[PDB]
Amino acid sequence: LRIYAPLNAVLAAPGLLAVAALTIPDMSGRSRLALAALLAVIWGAYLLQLAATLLKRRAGVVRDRTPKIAIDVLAVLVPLAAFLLDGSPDWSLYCAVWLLKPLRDSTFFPVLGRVLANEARNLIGVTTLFGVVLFAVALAAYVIERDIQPEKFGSIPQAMWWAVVTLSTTGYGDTIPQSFAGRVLAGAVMMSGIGIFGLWAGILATGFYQEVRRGDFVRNWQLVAAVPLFQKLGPAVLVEIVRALRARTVPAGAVICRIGEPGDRMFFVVEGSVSVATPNPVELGPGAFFGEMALISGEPRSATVSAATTVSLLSLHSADFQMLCSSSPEIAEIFRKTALERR
Amino acid sequence: LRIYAPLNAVLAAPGLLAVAALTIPDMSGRSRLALAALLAVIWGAYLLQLAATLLKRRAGVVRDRTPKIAIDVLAVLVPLAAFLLDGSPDWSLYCAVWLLKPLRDSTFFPVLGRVLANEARNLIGVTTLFGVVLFAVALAAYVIERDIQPEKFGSIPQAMWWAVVTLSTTGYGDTIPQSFAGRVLAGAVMMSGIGIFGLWAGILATGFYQEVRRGDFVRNWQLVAAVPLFQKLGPAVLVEIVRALRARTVPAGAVICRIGEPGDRMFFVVEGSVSVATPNPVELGPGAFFGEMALISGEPRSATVSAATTVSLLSLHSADFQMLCSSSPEIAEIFRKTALERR
Amino acid sequence: LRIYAPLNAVLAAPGLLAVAALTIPDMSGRSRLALAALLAVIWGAYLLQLAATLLKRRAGVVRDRTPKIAIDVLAVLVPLAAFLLDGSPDWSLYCAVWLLKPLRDSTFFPVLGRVLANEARNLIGVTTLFGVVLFAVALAAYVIERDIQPEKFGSIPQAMWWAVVTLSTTGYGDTIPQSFAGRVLAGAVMMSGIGIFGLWAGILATGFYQEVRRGDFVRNWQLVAAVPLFQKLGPAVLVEIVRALRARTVPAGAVICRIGEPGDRMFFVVEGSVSVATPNPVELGPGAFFGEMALISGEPRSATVSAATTVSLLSLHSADFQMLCSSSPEIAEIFRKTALERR
Amino acid sequence: LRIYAPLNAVLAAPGLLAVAALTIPDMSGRSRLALAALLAVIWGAYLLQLAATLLKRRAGVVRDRTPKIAIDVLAVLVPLAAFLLDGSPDWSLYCAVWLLKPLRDSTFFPVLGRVLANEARNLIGVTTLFGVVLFAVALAAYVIERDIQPEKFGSIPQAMWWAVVTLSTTGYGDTIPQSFAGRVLAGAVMMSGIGIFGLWAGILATGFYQEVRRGDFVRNWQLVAAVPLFQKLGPAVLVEIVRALRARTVPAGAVICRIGEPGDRMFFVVEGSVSVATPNPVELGPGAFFGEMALISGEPRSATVSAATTVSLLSLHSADFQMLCSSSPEIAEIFRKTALERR
Numbered sequence A, B, C, D: 001l002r003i004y005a006p007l008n009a010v011l012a013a014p015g016l017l018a019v020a021a022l023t024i025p026d027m028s029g030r031s032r033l034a035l036a037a038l039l040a041v042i043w044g045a046y047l048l049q050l051a052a053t054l055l056k057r058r059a060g061v062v063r064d065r066t067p068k069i070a071i072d073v074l075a076v077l078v079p080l081a082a083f084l085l086d087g088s089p090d091w092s093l094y095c096a097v098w099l100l101k102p103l104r105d106s107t108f109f110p111v112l113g114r115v116l117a118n119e120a121r122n123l124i125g126v127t128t129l130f131g132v133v134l135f136a137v138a139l140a141a142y143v144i145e146r147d148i149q150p151e152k153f154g155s156i157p158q159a160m161w162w163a164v165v166t167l168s169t170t171g172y173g174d175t176i177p178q179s180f181a182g183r184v185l186a187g188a189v190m191m192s193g194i195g196i197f198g199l200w201a202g203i204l205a206t207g208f209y210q211e212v213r214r215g216d217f218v219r220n221w222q223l224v225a226a227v228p229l230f231q232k233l234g235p236a237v238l239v240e241i242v243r244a245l246r247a248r249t250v251p252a253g254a255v256i257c258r259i260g261e262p263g264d265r266m267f268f269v270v271e272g273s274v275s276v277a278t279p280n281p282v283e284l285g286p287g288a289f290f291g292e293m294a295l296i297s298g299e300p301r302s303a304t305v306s307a308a309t310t311v312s313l314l315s316l317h318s319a320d321f322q323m324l325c326s327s328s329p330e331i332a333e334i335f336r337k338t339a340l341e342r343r
């Protein structure tokens, strides 16, 4: 269900992308002039934004900042500095700083610092074991091919390189054991590979799970707060739901729900309003749920539900939905009649 | 066990596969004439089916449709259009549309939109981070080999390409740092690799997990309606069972359970009938469980239980089976006497 | 710890491995005569074993069999047949059958069948999605390089091959887009790669998790069944322990616990006996636990605990151990005083 | 946050790394003289420490050792032996032993032995299955290319090598099916690959998870013990917290909490002291928590909290924090007043 609410999503990211677009030599006149010019203007928009932030201390209702400001500070100062110090050639390198911006929207890095942090004593141990494993292999591979390939196994670092290629799963094809036994040794190498392949894996596995778990405070602590519905529940029931709860702003003109289109979930409205294409034009206010008969029934969208405007929405899975109907019979009853209003 | 169980599974899939067989130049023979003709006939079968769906509004007693119809509409209209608009040599491209059909029987894509959707703000950030990482690497690799390989590192996009090959774990072997330091840098590239290799991973891991979760809850609900047995239980106990419950439809002639053959689980019958090769011919009706003494005992299939006909079966794990025997001692008692009937 | 513990593990496996050692042409004298001869003798030993099983209805202590016998039947008949039917030089191919044997001691394949089976309706869909994804890529890649490489992209299957190389993470290096855009297209391909990389993964993730889950049936009877200790507990407490419980059979002469050697767990004895190197020689009978002061204290092995003989041991985690001590104060008291006996 | 926190971490690791730096041929005098000499001195420092451990029976107040000592013994004796036995040019190989040390601070290897150990019966079966799969492929690949590439597929081991390259996801590029059908067979090979790719995976997945689970006794059993806070809770609540609890030792001069800097957690002090940059200079004693208003509020670090000295800190997640405040309202109340002192 994507039309325009991620309106903000729709227009800032591109500035970050254009950095790559410019990056090319042996380039013609028609595209280079426009693109190079655009970054200076984007830069200026951000520069204007900075004056507001450094200078201004009001955001609306609630907000907090510090290292985050530092990130923004670095982002604007660097491209500027490139412009100033460098009256010369490549300084577009300095522009790259844009990519710093997207990290702000995620639940990852300052937290990653925290999580990477609490297990630095062990995770580091795994990688060190890794450097070590690379070392023993270099010794093994080198002895078999030193005389035959002074050219390729001439040295430990040459052997070390092959370990690098072989260890990860890349295998370039330029260097290989010409002799029969070396191939046999690689057989052992293949076995150490299972473990190795797994290491690449340990790092992201903990990080993604962590990062997702973290969004629970932003997305699933604050978000839970607007829906008054969430309050009947205490700490144990809420966390399972918290892992489950999902966000997304739908806007002006978006077809939230297509009429006729399957709805295997229901939507809750936090902010903004939505419109229902039905018998009695229903505009939905905060504390509203729609497509609920979708679940009672197990069928579609009741109406074309189109976001009246920019609206933040929460959706509920069938497993979770039974919990809400059971927790509050009154709520099951309301979903059905409101659904009657919705359908 | 498989014989003619998903009778339906056995037949439709082949039409989807034939698209690949046809797709060959420098072709001759008996093979090309038959195959090209078959797609038009398959198209016609589906075309006939479409008239039925567009025209017909009765399905028995269990269905709902909309975007799904749209998929079917696209599927038939496209190969049709190629036939009409194109009197031209290549229109078999348009036929490919068949592969759209398999998505229909999965728990994934409409659902995928919901998963990918609720975490689009975090998930895309990781990939954007990926473009970023790729960029810095292009810079580092390019500086090392620009003079040496105007031919290979002639430009950022050339460097960028190497980052693509190297980042994933593919490594073609046509480009590499000739110089020693470059090889050393690749050592750093290798450590960034763990993170990288992991990204490829974050995407399917979440999708498969959800996809299975989506199908399972519905399957459990269906089993509960179908198996009266499921009703004693409330929302908390059923979900664990729901992840566990599993289904297929055995048919005519399938030997559901080989006699003598180990049975480490038992089967429940939702629809259809089954036949038991035992002292008293036993045909099993709905609400029937068999091979239960298999579990009480911990041994095989009681009988050659062959599907009397097309039958939908559910199987229960030993861990789960204890829960059913303990929840209802009456049920445990029944499993043993019926088992006496079954064995 | 290992000495001759799985006395059985030590000897049968080698016969399975020897199949590979023989497999070499341009072979000479001393190795070939012995190795070829050995398989016939191993075959004969198995043939004798078969006569016993086909003709024998007695057991060491409780068993069940049917499809398993069929596996054994196929295993001996094939190398036999090769011997008889083939006076021909290559029939060692038929010998390979040995590898069928190891599947017998695992918790996987009959189970894999049932599990793969209950989700063939969806796992197959993912792979099908894979064949189709492969198809769109072949079309895309072919278009860019048809004129340039009639030799490499001369045909869809030629393009299809590259999709195979690229899709998995192998990348041979013999084929690549010569032109700039193809490399750009490969950029999209790289992104579709993450999804693909994940598919390879979806299959094992379900199988390994489950295969381990399955051994619970063997494990519960094995540790829970012979340790009277396990009976205080009911179905909910046991399963968590069940995932946790672990086993091996130590033998004659094995030093179960090195004396002075850290013991981060304790061992339970199901079958066989063990000896303790301490003030009072202690031989441990069934229903015995040792190295428990290792946990109360959090320090090593009390004594060199050496398996008096072939013994089946279960070990308990510190997390689990607290549950045992808390569930039964009397048990906590016994562990310390017995420990006094052990230390 | 990191400054001189693990003071110890900062110094020992480098000695381990230096082994790689020295290991280079075609080297020059300026770098080589210093580096070669450093290992002898590092060796001597370790030699000194060993005499202390060998001849000493005290330290701090709570330790145990045996196999661990054996590791240390092997570590010093080896480089010594190389020095003594070998007046010879290459003995730096013997020095490598340093890397043995890192395993000491991890929760993995003795324990890995423990887990690998209770699952030798099942992991081994999969790996052997792997050799088996490799065998069938060597047979199939060899038949297609024996005449064409006596040079590449001349033998099963030559075919076997390709199986190694192909099986893992490396693909060098030197040996490929020239013929069309092999390319088709490779299509089957690609499918068996998913299964293959997964094997590499089963090994690290269980190992990392268990390894992390293991630090629960060191880090989350005895270590938690210093927070009196942990006592109210019983065995079930603690384990969830135990997986969650995390540690580092900040030192002299580290700014624990940047002031202004987001604090999305709070820190507990086990050992050492910390200083708070606020209205009342606050030095924090053991049993202290800071940045708690960070959670009540959901905003940063109250103060620049800088480690007064070497301090061991525990940090608490928001999900966990709610449990703490709810378990003891008295504690919630204390967090806010202390927070008043901290802020």
Ligand SMILES: [K+]
Pocket: A169, A170, A171, B169, B170, B171, C169, C170, C171, D169, D170, D171
């Ligand atoms: K590769």
Ligand SMILES: [K+]
Pocket: A170, A171, A172, A173, B170, B171, B172, B173, C170, C171, C172, C173, D170, D171, D172, D173
């Ligand atoms: K390659």
